[PDB]
Symmetry: none
Subunit: 130 residues, 2 copies
């Protein structure tokens, strides 16, 4: 490609829990500047993900694009981290949502159901150049 | 490695600004009929009215009017980009007005590697 997202990034699917960032970067006046690029970051259950760590993960997800030099200004207040998996026991698909807060929430261990759950972050973020 | 020197004899492989300019004098007599030039651009750049003015002046340097300066730009000018949305399977077109504050060049990577940002305008030019 002309900008192949993935310097070295794993060629095969992740072997453990990961955070998937899919943000759309916008300016203040509501103009879309950057379309969502797929980016993965491994995470560990037991970790606490706060709003500040989320802000830094999205700034790092931009470094994978042409907007590598932008900083996060403001994260959509309604963003949440969602995870979807199939529960072995009940036999249904289930989805958990965690809100992005200052105190934060702890990464759950869903390994009993899936070894590599995908924690999804899909929002808009106002970004500005450094 | 950035975005290319003297520019390609083929189609660019990165975002680029296509400049289509008609140069007139202070009386609207036409001096230069539509003249086309390409400039590579980088997503994330803020394109202001003043920057556009400089780009059109540079566009004139490859013509009999290289010694002329841009005096006024048509106030109805706009930058438009047309691409094919890969999610919607349709043609999409975005317009950006030329203003003093300007606008930030979007990255349309998800849909097209080398989008062409079209600038069609008429400008008053006068010898320096």
């Amino acid at each position: 490609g002309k900008y192949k997202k993935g310097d070295d990034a794993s060629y095969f699917e992740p072997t453990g829990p990961y955070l998937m960032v899919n943000v759309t970067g916008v300016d203040g006046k509501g103009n879309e500047l950057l379309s969502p690029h797929y980016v993965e970051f491994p995470i560990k259950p037991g970790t606490t993900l706060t709003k500040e760590k989320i802000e830094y993960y999205v700034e790092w997800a931009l470094d994978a694009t042409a907007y590598k030099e932008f900083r996060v200004v403001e994260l959509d207040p309604s963003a949440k981290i969602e995870v979807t998996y199939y529960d072995k026991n009940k036999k249904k698909e289930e989805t958990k949502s965690f809100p992005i807060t200052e105190k934060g929430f702890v990464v759950p261990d869903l390994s009993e159901h899936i070894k590599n759950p995908g924690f999804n972050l899909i929002t808009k973020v106002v970004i500005e150049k450094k």
